[PDB]
Amino acid sequence: MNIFEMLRIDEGLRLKIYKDTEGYYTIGIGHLLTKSPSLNAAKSELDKAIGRNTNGVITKDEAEKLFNQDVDAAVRGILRNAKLKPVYDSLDAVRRAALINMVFQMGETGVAGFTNSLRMLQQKRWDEAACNLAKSRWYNQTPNRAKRVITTFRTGTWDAYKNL
Ligand SMILES: *SCC1=C(Br)C(C)(C)N(O)C1(C)C
Ligand SMILES: [Cl-]
Ligand SMILES: [Cl-]
Ligand SMILES: [Cl-]
């Protein structure tokens, strides 16, 4: 298991524009195109992202390219952020993946806002961090995915992603 395999499980793979859990136009492996309710706007974002006039459909290779960029962007976002960087630096490799996962899903600013959870993570109070993380819109809206990510922070193992 690694961050790519982890996010691939959590995000799935779809080669045609679809709406994510929040109803936003998305493609590939959880690549958010736009929050605009306009399919045309989403298609424009897609063509720009891929560098060609797509019929709202991409190849697996193209999906994986966007995915690579997006994982890179999440890590980059964590390292540039004054709140996220110290937490990330304090974590082991498995828990680092859990933090990247959160940033991939909700964005740098969103995760940076989890002040109390971040402190507990920094303190290595894993059970307490786990409980605090669950007290969120994130957990309530995507409970199975949040449970997997939280289990990863709680245990520092890939147990939540085995047999998946
Ligand atoms: S997060 C607080 C709780 C814990 Br530690 C367990 C035992 C899982 N619970 O049922 C809660 C929600 C009270
Ligand atoms: Cl998805
Ligand atoms: Cl992009
Ligand atoms: Cl879920």
From Swiss-Prot:
Record bears the keyword Hydrolase: yes
Keyword field contains ATP-binding: no
UniProt-reported outcome of changing residue 20 to E/Q: Loss of 99% of enzymatic activity
GO MF annotation, one: lysozyme activity
Gene Ontology terms: biological process: cell wall macromolecule catabolic process; defense response to bacterium; peptidoglycan catabolic process; viral release from host cell by cytolysis
Family: Belongs to the glycosyl hydrolase 24 family.
Protein's name according to its UniProt entry: Endolysin
Gene source species: Enterobacteria phage T4 (Bacteriophage T4)
Highest classification ranks of the organism: Viruses, Duplodnaviria, Heunggongvirae, Uroviricota, Caudoviricetes
